[PDB]
Symmetry: C2
Subunit: 110 residues, 2 copies
């Protein structure tokens, strides 16, 4: 078995035309042995993952804070302890409307 | 899109020869659309004895200090640790602290 401390994984500071104020930790990568990809996202205050869609599904678990979820036609806030299923091709995004860092797990089957 | 509070899932208590002091919340089940996610809560002194399954498991520790039973020895980890358990690998879990331990379990 493999046991690793998520905070030891090097964060990637993402700042693009689609994503701002986000740090990404790849806990289990595309080329890793498990049949899943797992990323830990940290969204800074005011951080924004623009609405987008992909053919693959997503599972989200909110670890810390209040996360605003952008949907195709609207939005919704959830807090730590919420889990989210995003269907294939479903338009979605994320925003941190608080003054604290927000953390969530992103789960993708291979 | 499905949005759910994990704690509102009604927990299942598990009391078998090899599991004691453990509750399980099935967040995503077989009948559900996603391609299985469970939230385990281990009471103080609770124990998931050494066992194996042919599928792999992924674990993410949400709360507390989780003692992992391995094929060779034990290892205690804390909130924020992630664990990959290989297919058919013998493993278990114990809570040696005085507060509840919580972890997510992911099965592809």
């Amino acid at each position: 078995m493999i046991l690793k401390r998520a905070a030891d994984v090097t964060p990637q500071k993402i700042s693009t035309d689609k994503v701002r104020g986000v740090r990404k930790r790849v806990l289990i990568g595309l080329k890793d042995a498990p049949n899943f990809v797992i990323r830990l996202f940290t969204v800074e205050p005011g951080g924004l993952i623009d609405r987008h869609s992909h053919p693959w599904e997503h599972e989200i678990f909110v670890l810390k804070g209040k996360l605003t979820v952008l949907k195709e036609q609207g939005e919704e806030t959830v807090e730590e302890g919420f889990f989210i299923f995003v269907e294939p091709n479903e338009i979605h995004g994320f925003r941190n409307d608080t003054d604290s860092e927000v953390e969530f797990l992103q789960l993708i089957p291979k």
